[PDB]
Amino acid sequence: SMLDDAKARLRKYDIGGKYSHLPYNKYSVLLPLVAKEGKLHLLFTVRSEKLRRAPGEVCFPGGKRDPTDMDDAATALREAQEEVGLRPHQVEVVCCLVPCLIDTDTLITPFVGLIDHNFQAQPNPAEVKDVFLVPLAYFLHPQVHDQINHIFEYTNPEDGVTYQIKGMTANLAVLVAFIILEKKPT
């Protein structure tokens, strides 16, 4: 099926816990896959304007590891729960993709999670100003603006709202799209 096929593809790129004991400042992000209307979508947040890091920016759910987290995946789930109400039984963590090195002292580990069809985002306004889906296929033929560096613009056809997606977030979205959608029959 569509979902089993996605998980089978994602597993081939799983690095596991290989880079997890390294002594960095550690953050995790969840790349949440949602199936609507026969297609895969990614769930994104727009960070609250109030926040320390990256106010107002499109990001995946995630944040800093803390001492309660059993591992790096748990960081991602905890933070996703706090930001959009995603509960443990509503997500299956399928793999750990390549970490992202930032600022010489920081490692951000991304996990891809399959999201239950009955989950409905409950944006927490202290963390998140908005939550939106983008079809995964969009990342194969994005609308690119050069700001010099590359920015994606996605317009939700439901309401005409335009979102700007950039940096690590845009990079990880392209990666997931390539992994799951490359070389597929129609």
CA distance 47 to 45: 6
- Residue 72, both tokens: 């790096």
Q: How far apart are CB 55 and ligand H2M at their closest, in Å?
A: 10
Residue 24 engages ligand H2M in binding (rule: CB under 6 A):
no
Q: Which of 81, 129, 167, 171 binds ligand H2M (CB under 6 A)?
A: 167
CA distance 80 to 86: 6
In the bound complex, which residue of the shown chain has the CB atom lying closest to ligand H2M?
Answer: 62
The contact pattern for ligand H2M, residues 52-71, with x = CB under 6 A and - = no contact, is: -xx----x--xx--------
Q: Which amino acid is at 140?
A: L
Part of the chain binding ligand H2M (CB under 6 A), chosen from 7-15, 65-73, 102-110, 152-160: 102-110
Judge whether 131 and 121 are in contact, CB under 8 Å. Answer: yes
Residue 83 in marked binding region: yes
Burial status of residue 157 (CB atoms within 10 A of its CB: 0-12, 13-18, 19 or more): exposed
- Residue 95, both tokens: 């793999």
Chain contacts with ligand H2M (rule: CB under 6 A): 27, 29, 53-54, 59, 62-63, 102-103, 106, 108, 167-168
